[PDB]
Amino acid sequence: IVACDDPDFLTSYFAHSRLHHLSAWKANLKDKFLNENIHKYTKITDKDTYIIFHIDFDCFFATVAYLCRSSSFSACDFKRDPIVVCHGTKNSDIASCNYVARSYGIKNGMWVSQAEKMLPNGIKLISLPYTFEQFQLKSEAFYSTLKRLNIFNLILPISIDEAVCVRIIPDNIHNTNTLNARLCEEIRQEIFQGTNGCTVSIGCSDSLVLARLALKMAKPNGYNITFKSNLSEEFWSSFKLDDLPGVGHSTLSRLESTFDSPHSLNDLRKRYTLDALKASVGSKLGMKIHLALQGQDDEESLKILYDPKEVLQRKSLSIDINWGIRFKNITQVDLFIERGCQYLLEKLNEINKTTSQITLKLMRRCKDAPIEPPKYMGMGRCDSFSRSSRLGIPTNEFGIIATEMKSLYRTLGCPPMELRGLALQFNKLVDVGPDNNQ
DNA sequence: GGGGTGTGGTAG
DNA sequence: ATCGCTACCACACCCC
Ligand SMILES: Nc1ccn([C@H]2C[C@H](O)[C@@H](COP(=O)(O)OP(=O)(O)OP(=O)(O)O)O2)c(=O)n1
Ligand SMILES: [Ca+2]
Ligand SMILES: [Ca+2]
Ligand SMILES: [Ca+2]
């Protein structure tokens, strides 16, 4: 066991943290895209008419961890057992659950302790460990298969297990549902073969937003083709409000307050007005939802098609550590800040940039919150504080950056024993060119 | 019109 | 036990 004051803490935490893995895998996929396209264009233009195939592994970690499970789980049945992937036994996140588990109401992100209560007696939850390297290998097979099929003009990485794949249709060609279904079935079968048993679902449409909703309707282990010309009340009635991309729990709560608790996207689209929507959730998010309820993308979402190199380019670099943070004094806090800045500077030098602006953010135990929260080593209920600094000259120098980060910590006034989380951010990245003469 | 700050929220 | 990350738009509210 490795405590936060141990030099090996960051290495250990990132080795175990699935959320760190997701972030790192996504960042690597974006960098790979940029490196592979440095001399190519491969951007969608205004003259192109396109179809979106949104392809995503079903219950990704649960599927892979099952297929790669150790001999102690040899008898586990993926079709009949409720399966989760997690580290622990109580207040530990279910990173992924299979569709048997979801039949009982279990969802990704739930704690094991919450999920166990949803099972009737005699039904036992199977908890599989993470298989991080094999998650990545299955991802490799997925992205390799997509490219090998030679059916897409543009393949955009969304996640370790998910890609937006764009097919341009010439005016030349009469696209049909039958042709799209055959492509869906080819993709699904080739990925199933190429990954040695993992399944993907596919949403197929003429917008990014409808392709995402079609993907949800397709799952598990299926495909759905719903173009704007195919839209119906039956389609909209099939979705919850937070099935919309960009709508999470906070936005959902506002929509339910404003529109008398709609229970489907059909309820919402029959009740809303654009003006009332903007007043409830904000101008830009309101417009996004209004357009989505017509099956249409907003301008911000379309940028990934028309300028993927800009959208996928990294603009900031940070670490966040909000688990395991228990320091007794400022000396140990300062050493942790130094270790984090060393880690960040290794990443910054790998991309050959400097930074011009940095931020320290912290989580501090709320005055009335227990010192030991419900989740072992968790941050618990906290107040957040952050402060940024503009550096005089863009730099990659540890002495400058770590000294200023430690200064920023002091300005926020958090006693070491009350600290529950820390974020170190390089907010603005600056190119390094061949001319460095003053 | 231009700039700045810290914070909210989402995704996977 | 248990590994609650992290990029990035949008916002509110401040300056000239
Ligand atoms: N709260 C979450 C959500 C996702 N993930 C990890 C594990 C997921 O398997 C993987 C992909 O996320 P998805 O949202 O695509 O979810 P799944 O693939 O598990 O299920 P599905 O896509 O079938 O709904 O990211 C996680 O660790 N914690
Ligand atoms: Ca998935
Ligand atoms: Ca996914
Ligand atoms: Ca959503």
3-state secondary structure of A66: helix
Any atom of ligand 1 within 6 Å of the Cβ of A426? no
Q: What is the dihedral of CA A207, A212, A218, A220, to 10 degrees?
A: 160
* CA pseudo-torsion sign A15, A20, A24, A25: positive
- Between 3.40.50.970, 3.40.1170.60, 3.60.15.10, 3.90.1170.40, what CATH number should domain A60-132 receive? 3.40.1170.60
CA–CA gap between residue A420 and residue A422 (Å, rounded): 7
Resolution value, angstrom units: 1.4
- Residue A197's SS3 state is coil
With a CB cutoff of 8 Å and minimum separation 6, the contacts of A284 are A298, A300
How far is the C-alpha of A102 from the C-alpha of A247, rounded, in Å? 21
Q: Is A58 annotated as a binding residue?
A: yes
Strand, helix or coil at A124? Answer: coil
C-beta separation of A133 from A18 below 8 A: no
* A50-57, strands of its sheet edge to edge: A154-159, A162-168, A50-57, A200-205, A223-225
Q: Which residue is nearest to nucleotide B10 (CA to C1')?
A: A246
Quote the ligand 2 centre to A32 CA distance (angstroms). Answer: 21
**Amino acid, single-letter form, for residue A342:** Q
CB-based contacts of A32: which residues, under 8 Å, 6+ apart? A157
Interior CA angle at A104 toward A111 and A81, to 5°? 90
Fold match flag (A8-23+311-431 vs A60-132): no
Query: Determined by which method?
Result: X-ray
CA quadruple A67, A93, A158, A287: dihedral, nearest 10: 140
Amino acid at A399: G
Give one word for A262, left, alpha or beta, with left for phi > 0 and alpha for psi -120 to 50: beta
Tell me, which fold does domain A8-23+311-431 have in CATH?
Answer: Dna Ligase; domain 1 (3.30.1490)
Kindly state the helix (H) or strand (E) to which residue A393 belongs, with its residue range: strand A382-395
Between residue 375 and residue 414 of chain A, the positions with Cβ below 7 Å from nucleic chain B are 384-388, 390
A130 lines ligand 1 (CB under 6 A): no
Q: How far apart are CA A279 and CA A191, in angstroms?
A: 44
Smallest Cα–Cα separation from A161: which of A206, A218, A200, A103?
Answer: A200
d(CA A73, CA A165): 35
A96 is in an annotated binding site: yes
